[PDB]
Ligand binder design. Structure first.
Ligand SMILES: [Cl-]
Ligand SMILES: [Cl-]
Ligand SMILES: [Mg+2]
Ligand SMILES: [Mg+2]
Ligand SMILES: [Mg+2]
Ligand SMILES: [Mg+2]
Ligand SMILES: [Mg+2]
Ligand SMILES: [Mg+2]
Lengths: 188, 197, 171, 193, 134, 106
RNA sequence: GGCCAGCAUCAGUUUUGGUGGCAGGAUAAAUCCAUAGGAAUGUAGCUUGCCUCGGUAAGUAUUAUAGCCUGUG
RNA sequence: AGAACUGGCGAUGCGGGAUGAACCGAACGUAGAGUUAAGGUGCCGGAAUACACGCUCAUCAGACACCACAAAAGGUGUUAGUUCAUCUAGACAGGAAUGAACUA
RNA sequence: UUUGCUCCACACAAUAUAGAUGGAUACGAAUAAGGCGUCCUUGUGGCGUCGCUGAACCAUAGCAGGCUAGCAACGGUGCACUUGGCGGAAAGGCCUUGGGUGCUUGCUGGCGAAUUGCAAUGUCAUUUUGCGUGGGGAUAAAUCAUUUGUAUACGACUUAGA
């Protein structure tokens, strides 16, 4: 109904510096630097002090206000990404055919290889996005760990691994074979 | 006022600009339009892409070389919108269209001239903030325009030369401003101030 | 059009049986006195056994706003006919006069409910005397202490076809 | 009403119109994409078709029934004498397409190439390229300027070559001239080659 | 190393904000915002320039950088007292915005003889400027 | 000086017309710098000349003139209506005309 | 005295500006002035807790070092 | 297909509805000037890219009587409204309003 | 095929004008943001300032613009040459060096104008082309006919012939 004013608060810890100009957000922390372009929302940022940043929408409708809270979450994820990081844990689920997963190098592209999924002869490869590191945890059976500063890069990279192992022409209720995200958390 | 008016097409709505240009041509003003690939159309990219494909399927059934001609270049897309607002089948309409030139990028003859804008057709002054719009450059590429990269490379070269020109012009302006300021505070300057100049 | 408020007083025609009939008054919003008298008979025929040929208009007087330069919160009750049925509705309008509020009300009904002038009855217009009796949030948000807001993205008016610089929307 | 039975259409609509070709020498409308990390080389060649014959060879294809067995095949023989380079042409990228900027010719041309420029060779004075050869009479300043222009501006380099028709049993005596694109190396390397 | 967020500098619709009227009977005159009616309507009053107390659309005025202390809903007598105390007129006259307005009016009031004197004076000043540049 | 102009530049737009019927006896004229009917009142009654060239010389000149006058305003944008002794030809739609400062009321 | 025009003073029709004197209404309503009463989106002052030594938060307080609303003349 | 009263077409041009025997406006000797009707004023196209308050975003938007079509039933799309209940004595979700059923 | 062809400077004729009548006056990018000036540790930095339209800036005085005298500056500007660099998207334009020459209204003087008779575009622009002067520059092809069959209804195509 064209609300006069809507505000959201963004906190920053001691070790994180945030520079915003012309809707360009650069977050620098102990773990690195993240950047984001937000020239599609029409909001205004202001600085209250060294530990608080406000974002506001003036004379906005229901749909415009709904995107204001999205900005706060996106900026907050950048802040905690450069401080705590993100960790996604995935498990291998199979009934008969073991799933073999290894990191391979192909023309300097840092791929990950999936072999013998449901006995398939086809070789499955998923590119590893920049800034994402992949480790195979010990003392845990069939677990792969993805880490990075960007939550979107880590989450989407893990999503690619789930989609590449979809069963076709079978009852997926019975054939529950694949790799699935089992835990979302932080590096620290 | 000028014998030739050169309009920079960047950031202009296609229909609003075409209406303004068509009236100017009929009134006897020569118009040159540059950077037709930076034109904007209201509505998202997918919606406008569907509109062009609806235009594509229209053709003479018994001979396709007779049917409507589908031009893919951004300059020709703007020309189609402009020709529809002119009685182009008359001698008066033909004469008006001969006073118009449309180019992609800024060709060498006009790159050293002054460009103007049309406020009535500017996207930033017309569309409500937040509304979706499409750029004519990417729409043309998706429908078979082969020269997007060539224009981009040439435009980058032009801007480097134009930036260097502006640096010399800016430094000269500062020198002129200093001389005028020093030449002020005199009796001649006092008399000019009383008369408004 | 631009509305004025009139008081209209009418009566039944005097008879030998009943001399000096009762006087009935109502407040009518109309663009002129000719429409105001027509509206008076329209509502009177909905309440009493009387019509124009059987009665007379006693006096019609324009009513002016007491404090036209004071911002007031108005509560309005309306009854209107939709495409299928009749409904009652309460709305709140913030203006400086009753005629200004009524003009806004007719625009609002036309815009949101497609209700024409003929389909609307003004039941009552009353100024809300105290805060916290306002029950609509779109009006209450202007009653906050020290209200300030900017006007982003200013679009200026151009009197010439061509401009020699890129415009700015600063304010 | 609909046709009683369905059949595929007769003929291919992508080979229209079925008209005569503009010239007896078919145009090359696409060259291989240039890889400039390779030595300079030609991308095509000119020859004359002589005829067909038959060969016998051993088939090397595992899984085939005729693996490691002799097969009889038909082949075509093309007479390909060496071609002679007699010029170079440079092209510039333009929003309207590729445009030829400069052409530089060799100092001397044989009667084979010169016949291509005439329709009545037996009556002509044979004045073709007589004044152009004078551009080599000096130190070559005119030729150096044009070659430098190609190096500075051109994005595509092609060479003009002609066949040695006198070495074939044909009676034409008039050589065929054509452009061949050079792939590999930088623009300067292409021009120097 | 500290956070750097670029700040906005919009002119605010508030009580005490000085506005310049561009359309209507009072075009070119100053006024002060007394009350806010809605997103698009306010109540203005300028007693010094003879602007009647009225409700006006925000599209009829232009916000100015100037502002002064004023109670909400103040009457005309109070507006005059606050306007004079804050010295609004002299602050507006010092701005380049007002000077360009005054300069534009003066230039349009010149006569043919005065326009001739401008040309002569401009050439005399030009001679000195060109000599200084060289 | 480099300028000798004593007239105001103008453009011949079209005849007075409805959607499908035109009236050659009245021509519509656009005057530069005029964008308001109130401003166009200044030019009412002023003489208008259309100047053109011909190959044949008749009265010791190869330049011919058609004379007219401003009669009234037209629309809200400063266009005016003009009548000429002989109607202007239709091929001059978009051609320049001269609005003189006489007869003067200054 | 044949052709084409310019200006002035009038007549008929009409279009577009500037300006003067009057009448009516709640003998406009307001503003402004005087006076009575009142409230908060509560001014000055005062109290209470943490506070980069003056800055907020809420309690009291109806004109005081801001003002406003209502009735009456 | 067949009747009733009236107005029309036929026998009738003219302005408007792109186009049309019947609709809207208006009926016609030859001309000049002024003013309008119905219908219109981004460009084609004569005339405000006028003013004002709202509503709508459609991967098949919508756009003006006669007229050149769309329905039942649905949508936590968005807007306004009706009724009841919870909430200052801290509800809903996991420190401010919220929930349910309905109307267009 | 009776000295033809081409370029340069002006001479006279013809030709027509989709419409000169002081000047088309060059950053880029953003718009819920920028321009300019300034300082430093050169940054997504600090400070100051501007907008609210070109309603600007530049130019603009002289027989459509004459003939002469002086003063102050060593500038401004036009024409024809000259030095160097840059420009290929349709560059055909931009910048720069030196000298010669005309004018200067930056300032002060002296002569001339009439009669176009009270207004009449009152003729001052650029398109094409032709004929005569003289100063340089260069001295070919195509078609028919004949011939060939990689071609072909006829044209056309493809070959050969001092
Ligand atoms: Cl096919
Ligand atoms: Cl043949
Ligand atoms: Mg194609
Ligand atoms: Mg072919
Ligand atoms: Mg029948
Ligand atoms: Mg009959
Ligand atoms: Mg129709
Ligand atoms: Mg028009």
């Amino acid at each position: 109904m064209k609300y006069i004013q809507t505000e959201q608060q963004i906190e920053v810890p001691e070790g994180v510096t945030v520079s915003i100009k012309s809707r360009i957000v650069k977050v620098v922390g102990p773990r690195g630097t993240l950047t984001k372009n937000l020239k599609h929302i029409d909001v205004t940022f202001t600085k209250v002090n060294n530990q608080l940043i406000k974002v506001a929408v003036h004379n906005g409708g229901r749909k415009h206000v709904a995107a204001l809270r999205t900005v706060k979450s996106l900026v907050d994820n950048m802040i905690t990404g450069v401080t705590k990081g993100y960790k996604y844990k995935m498990r291998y689920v199979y009934a008969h055919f073991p799933i073999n997963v290894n990191i391979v190098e192909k023309d300097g592209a840092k791929f990950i290889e999936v072999r013998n999924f449901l006995g398939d002869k086809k070789i499955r490869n998923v590119p590893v996005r920049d800034g994402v590191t992949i480790e195979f945890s010990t003392n845990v059976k069939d677990e792969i760990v993805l880490s990075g500063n960007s939550v979107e890069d880590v989450s989407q990279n893990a999503a690619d691994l789930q989609q590449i192992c979809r069963v076709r022409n079978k009852d997926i209720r019975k054939f529950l074979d694949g790799i699935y995200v089992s835990h979302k958390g932080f590096i620290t | 006022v000028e014998p030739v008016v050169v309009i920079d097409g960047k950031g202009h709505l296609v229909g609003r600009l075409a209406s303004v240009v068509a009236k100017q041509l009929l009134n006897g003003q020569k118009i040159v339009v540059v950077r037709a690939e930076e034109l904007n159309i209201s509505g998202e990219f997918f919606r406008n892409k569907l509109k062009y494909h609806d235009f594509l399927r229209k053709a003479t059934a018994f001979n396709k070389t007779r049917g409507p001609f589908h031009f893919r270049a951004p300059s020709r897309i703007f020309y189609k919108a402009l020709r529809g607002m002119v009685s182009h089948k008359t001698a008066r309409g033909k004469a008006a269209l001969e006073r118009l030139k449309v180019f992609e990028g800024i060709p060498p003859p006009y790159d050293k001239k002054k460009r103007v804008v049309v406020p009535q057709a500017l996207r930033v002054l017309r569309l409500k903030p937040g509304r979706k719009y499409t750029t004519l450059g990417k729409l043309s590429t998706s429908v078979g325009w082969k020269y997007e990269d060539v224009v981009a490379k040439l435009e980058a070269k032009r801007k480097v030369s134009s930036a260097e020109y502006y640096a010399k012009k800016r430094a000269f302006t500062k020198k002129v401003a200093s001389a005028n300021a020093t030449a002020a505070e005199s009796d001649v300057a006092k008399q000019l101030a009383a008369l408004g100049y | 059009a631009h509305f004025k408020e009139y008081q209209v007083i009418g009566r039944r025609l005097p008879t030998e049986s009943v001399p000096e009939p009762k006087l009935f008054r109502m407040r009518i919003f109309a663009s002129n006195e000719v429409i105001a008298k027509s509206r008076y008979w329209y509502f009177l025929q909905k309440l009493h056994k009387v019509k124009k040929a059987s009665g007379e208009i006693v006096s019609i007087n324009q009513i002016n706003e007491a404090h036209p330069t004071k911002v007031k919160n108005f509560g309005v009750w309306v009854r209107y006919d939709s495409r299928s049925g009749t409904h009652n509705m309460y709305k709140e309008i913030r203006d400086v006069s009753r005629v200004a509020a009524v003009e806004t009300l007719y625009q609002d009904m036309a815009a949101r409910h497609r209700a024409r002038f003929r389909s609307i009855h003004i039941l009552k217009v009353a100024e809300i005397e105290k805060t916290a009796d306002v029950k609509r949030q779109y009006v209450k948000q202007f009653l906050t202490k020290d209200l300030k807001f900017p006007l982003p993205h200013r679009v200026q008016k151009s009197t010439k076809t061509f401009s020699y610089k890129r415009p700015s929307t600063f304010y | 009403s609909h046709r009683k039975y369905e059949a595929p259409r007769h003929g291919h609509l992508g080979f229209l119109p079925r008209k005569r070709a503009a010239s007896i020498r078919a145009r090359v409308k696409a060259f291989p994409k240039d890889d400039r990390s390779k030595p300079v080389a030609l991308t095509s060649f000119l020859g004359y078709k002589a005829g067909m014959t038959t060969i016998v060879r051993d088939l090397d294809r595992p899984g085939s029934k005729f693996h490691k067995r002799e097969v009889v095949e038909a082949v075509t023989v093309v007479d390909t004498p060496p071609v002679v380079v007699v010029g170079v042409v440079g092209y510039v990228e333009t929003p309207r397409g590729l445009r030829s900027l400069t052409t530089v010719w060799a100092e001397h041309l044989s009667d084979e190439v010169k016949r291509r420029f005439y329709k009545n060779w037996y009556k002509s004075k044979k004045k073709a390229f007589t004044k152009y050869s004078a551009k080599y009479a000096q130190d070559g300043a005119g030729i150096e300027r044009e070659l430098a222009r190609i190096k500075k501006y051109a994005s595509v380099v092609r060479v003009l070559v002609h066949t040695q028709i006198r070495k074939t049993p044909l009676a034409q005596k008039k050589a065929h001239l054509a452009e061949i694109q050079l792939n590999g190396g930088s623009i300067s390397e292409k021009v120097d080659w | 190393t500290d956070s750097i967020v670029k700040a906005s500098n919009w002119r605010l619709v508030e009580v005490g904000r000085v506005v310049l009227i561009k359309k209507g009977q009072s075009a070119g005159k100053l006024a002060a915002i007394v009350e806010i009616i809605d997103q698009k309507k306010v109540l203005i009053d300028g007693p010094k320039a003879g602007v009647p107390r009225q409700a006006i659309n925000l599209g009829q005025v232009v916000l100015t950088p100037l502002t002064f202390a004023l109670p909400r809903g103040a009457r005309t007598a109070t507006v005059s007292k606050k306007w004079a105390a804050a010295a609004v007129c002299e602050k507006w006259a010092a701005s380049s915005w007002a000077k360009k307005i005054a300069q534009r009016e003066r230039r349009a009031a010149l006569t043919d003889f005065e326009r001739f004197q401008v040309m002569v004076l401009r050439k005399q000043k030009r001679y000195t400027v060109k000599k200084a540049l060289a | 000086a480099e300028s000798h102009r004593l007239y105001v530049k103008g453009k011949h737009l079209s005849y007075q017309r409805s959607k499908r019927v035109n009236n050659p006896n009245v021509s519509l004229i656009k005057i530069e710098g005029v964008a308001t009917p109130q401003d166009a009142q200044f030019y009412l009654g002023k003489r208008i000349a259309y100047v053109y060239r011909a190959s044949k010389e008749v009265r010791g000149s190869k330049i011919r003139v058609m004379w007219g006058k401003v009669t009234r305003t037209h629309g809200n944008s400063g266009v005016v209506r003009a009548t000429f002794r002989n109607n202007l030809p239709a091929k001059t739609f978009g051609a320049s005309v001269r609005i003189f400062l006489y007869p003067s009321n200054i």
